[PDB]
Nucleic acid binder design. Structure first.
Ligand SMILES: [Zn+2]
Lengths: 134, 120, 208, 68, 292
RNA sequence: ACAUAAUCCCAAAAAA
């Protein structure tokens, strides 16, 4: 498995998670194209992370075929918070919290296989007949 | 309501809109091609065709003359418009002011970019 | 007895009596009977009335739509609608039809799509008076004001409030037909018709 | 107005995930007919065009500087 | 007929395993692939019987899935065509200005495919008997599949529902996603496998013996085997749809020949259902023509 | 004869 991580980078975790779930389960190529033409602040960063992950995959692991690489797991954690003073009216100060995001990428070789297909009639006729016999 | 209405706003006043059109048309006739937002471009098309047609009317004619002087203040644009750009489009009717799309977006507002160009 | 039409426009007419009459024109492009569905409990049978533009065939793609047009031997059509026929004696198989089907002096009902106003305030919808524009009134001018009473917490279902208006089906009743043109396929109908010109409308037999 | 009580995790997740549908993924990817590079659909390439537009801008600046 | 087909498939699998073993017996080789499709690309690997499609996979998944044909040293080849030593690899696709090669390959793949389908349907009923004739490609956009049948099939008429069922089974095998195999075999073992088919025997004996190359390429799809002098369609996912248009009966030298013909869909794209019906009419008319 | 939706806790029933 090929792991890559980026910490102490300042971006919205909730916003980066949008592009993080986007490439999860998807193949390297499709994820690359997506992140390239995806419009957001996380697009560039996650693109860099992916590119570095591919470079590490090729150089360190010495992978024979690049097409056998896909994205198995992607996650976004929260780092330290920078507290800033936001000046408001009537002599009151609010607390502006600048967040941070630690991006983690876990890659596994082999062809990507994901099936979300579920037959309704089969699952119903099986679960009902098994629940009636229990 | 927006029902049956051309002549968009784009967050500018009437004078600001007209002046914007005059500036974009200035750059367009000067450089023969320009890059701007898709809305401003699509809006600029018709006015460009209008100025071209006004140039096609006549050089000696006063109506076309004062119209051309009204929209374009610059003294450099008019002779290049009438003597050079106009006679090549003489045969064309709707064949000028082509619009194309630009692959990337701005780093700030991510505004959709488009280019307007006359036929060479 | 009825057919699907297309709103054309309006214009005044002058009767020999000298009385002015404001009428609207309903144009008939094409009409064909597609499917005939018999029923029992409803005590009536349904027929298919269809007005095509023939252009939409390529830009509108569906399996069932195209297969329907092809298997029925029907040319490409823009609008397919249904009509309820109570009388079983007047029911005919699939046939093309003309705008001569209507006669002058007959009162008809017109079903069409009302003009969409988009998102509209409490005004222009339920026709509320609103608040005054003066005398210390602050930002209450177009506001609906109070809604419910302290007794009942929740507001009653069906309460009048600002929202989307128009773009829905409406039927106008009691519209007299002054005259019809077969060759030009034009229908002269006295009254008002829902929606803008070129929008699909429906001419049906009224109830009097 | 002010919130009556603190939001539970479940409501937050169900609100921030399902209805927004995250980011809907369509296919914008198409191969450039010229250089064969991957670019956006219904749009000019970002490889064989931007360089030619910069060369055309430099040629227009050189022609405008030579004419003056 | 099932035992003979299973014995022929087992003998063909054993002959393919023996030929592959004797040819790949030396696993030490140098394969260098260098060339510009897109700008320049330079790669060096060590393998025997190297596949250029594996190099397409080496580049990326995109160029891999978009790979149709492989141009090597100026000579067009299939993506399954083995490469040796130094080679210049180019990727040819349908959208390119040279549709000819992928078109011919497409028509020959379609002929083969139904070559399997008809046989499988004829394996459903033991009553029928099938003998394969040679296939005739037509650059006009047509392909003619020639065969002969038992007397019982000569007496019984080909009702419309039949051909519809053949089409359904064809699409069935089309979404079944079965990979094509490319084998290199001698004319002898091939003669032995094709013994039950007279026309193919005559084909190999007459044509292949005059050829200096004793190495013949057998394309295997499922339990079906076909002889091809040219490239084959990359996968079963490449072909979106298929149709059976019509048949013909030719009389030559007091012999009857039954020729089936149909059409194919390139790059998994169809304009509409209307133009599809139009394509049916066009297909049948092109069958009526029988170009030669 | 009082003011949001009914029955004096469901539905009904009958007159040890
Ligand atoms: Zn390009």
């Amino acid at each position: 498995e090929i792991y890559h991580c980026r910490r102490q980078i300042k971006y919205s975790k909730d916003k980066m998670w949008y592009l993080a779930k986007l490439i999860r389960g998807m193949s390297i190529d499709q994820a690359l194209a997506q992140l390239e033409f995806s419009d957001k602040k996380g697009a560039q960063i996650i693109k860099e992370v992916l590119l570095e992950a591919q470079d590490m995959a090729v150089r360190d692991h010495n992978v024979e075929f690049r097409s056998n690489l896909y994205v198995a797991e992607s996650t976004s954690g929260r780092g330290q918070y920078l507290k800033r003073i936001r000046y408001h009216g009537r002599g009151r100060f609010g607390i502006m919290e600048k967040v941070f995001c630690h991006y983690f990428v876990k890659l596994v070789e082999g062809x990507x296989x994901x099936x979300x297909x579920x037959x309704x009639x089969x699952x119903x006729x099986x679960x009902x007949x098994x629940x009636x016999x229990x | 309501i927006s029902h049956g209405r051309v002549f968009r706003r784009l967050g500018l006043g009437p004078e600001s809109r007209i002046h914007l059109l005059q500036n974009l048309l200035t750059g367009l006739v000067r450089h023969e091609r320009i890059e701007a937002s898709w809305a401003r471009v699509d809006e600029l098309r018709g006015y460009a065709e209008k100025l071209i047609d006004y140039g096609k009317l006549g050089d000696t004619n006063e109506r076309a003359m004062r119209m051309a002087d009204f929209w374009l203040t610059e003294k450099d644009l008019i002779p290049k418009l009438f003597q050079v750009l106009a006679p090549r489009f003489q045969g064309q009717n709707g064949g000028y002011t082509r619009m194309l799309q630009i692959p990337n977006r701005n780093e700030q507002d991510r505004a959709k970019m488009a280019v307007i160009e006359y036929k060479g | 007895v009825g057919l699907i039409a297309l709103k054309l426009g309006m214009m005044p007419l002058w009767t020999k009596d000298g009385q002015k009459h404001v009428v609207t024109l309903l144009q008939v492009q094409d009409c064909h009977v597609l499917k005939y569905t018999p029923k029992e409990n409803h005590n009536g049978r349904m027929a298919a009335l269809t007005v095509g533009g023939k252009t939409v065939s390529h830009f509108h793609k569906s399996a069932s739509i195209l297969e329907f047009y092809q298997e029925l031997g029907l040319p490409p059509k823009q609008k397919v609608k249904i009509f309820n026929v109570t009388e079983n004696a007047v029911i005919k198989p699939g046939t093309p039809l003309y705008a001569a089907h209507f006669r002058p002096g007959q009162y008809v009902d017109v079903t069409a799509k009302t003009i969409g106003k988009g998102f509209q305030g409490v005004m222009r919808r339920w026709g509320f008076k609103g608040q005054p524009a003066t005398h210390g009134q602050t930002k209450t001018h177009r506001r609906p004001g109070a809604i419910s009473t302290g007794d009942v917490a929740r507001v009653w279902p069906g309460t009048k409030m600002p929202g989307q208006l128009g773009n829905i089906d409406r039927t106008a009743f009691g519209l007299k037909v002054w005259r019809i043109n077969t060759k030009h396929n034009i229908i002269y109908v006295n009254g008002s018709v829902p929606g803008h010109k070129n929008c699909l409308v429906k001419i049906k037999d009224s109830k009097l | 107005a002010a919130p009556k009580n603190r939001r539970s995790i479940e409501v937050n997740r169900c609100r921030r995930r399902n209805p927004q549908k995250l980011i809907k993924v369509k296919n914008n990817i198409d191969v450039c007919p010229e250089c064969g590079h991957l670019k956006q659909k219904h749009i000019l390439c970002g490889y064989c065009x931007x360089x030619x537009x910069x060369x055309x801008x430099x040629x227009x600046x050189x022609x405008x500087x030579x004419x003056x | 007929x099932x035992x003979x087909x299973x014995x022929x498939x087992x003998x063909x699998x054993x002959x393919x395993x023996x030929x592959x073993x004797x040819x790949x017996x030396x696993x030490x080789x140098x394969x260098x692939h260098v060339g510009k499709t897109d700008p320049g690309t330079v790669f060096v690997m060590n393998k025997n019987i190297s596949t250029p499609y594996s190099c397409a996979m080496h580049l990326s998944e995109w160029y891999c899935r978009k790979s149709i044909l492989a141009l090597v040293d100026g000579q067009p080849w299939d993506m399954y065509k083995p490469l040796t030593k130094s080679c210049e690899i180019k990727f040819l696709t349908f959208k390119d200005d040279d549709p000819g090669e992928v078109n011919k390959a497409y028509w020959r793949s379609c002929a083969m495919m139904m070559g399997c389908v008809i046989e499988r349907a004829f394996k459903d009923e033991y009553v029928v008997s099938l003998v394969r004739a040679p296939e005739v490609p037509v650059i006009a956009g047509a392909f003619c599949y020639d065969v002969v049948l038992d007397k019982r099939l000569d007496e019984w008429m080909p009702t419309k529902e039949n051909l519809h069922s053949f089409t359904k089974d064809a699409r069935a095998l089309i979404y079944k996603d079965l990979p094509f195999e490319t084998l290199e075999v001698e004319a002898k073992v091939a003669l032995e496998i094709f013994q039950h088919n007279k026309y193919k025997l005559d084909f190999i004996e007459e044509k292949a013996s005059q050829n200096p190359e004793r190495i013949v390429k057998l394309h295997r799809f499922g339990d079906f085997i076909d002889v091809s002098e040219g490239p084959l369609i990359p996968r079963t996912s490449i072909c979106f749809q298929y149709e059976v248009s019509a048949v013909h009966n030719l009389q030559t030298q007091s012999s009857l020949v039954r020729r089936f013909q149909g059409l194919s869909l390139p790059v998994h794209l169809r304009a509409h259902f209307t133009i599809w019906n139009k394509l049916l009419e066009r297909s049948r008319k092109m069958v009526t023509e029988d170009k030669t």
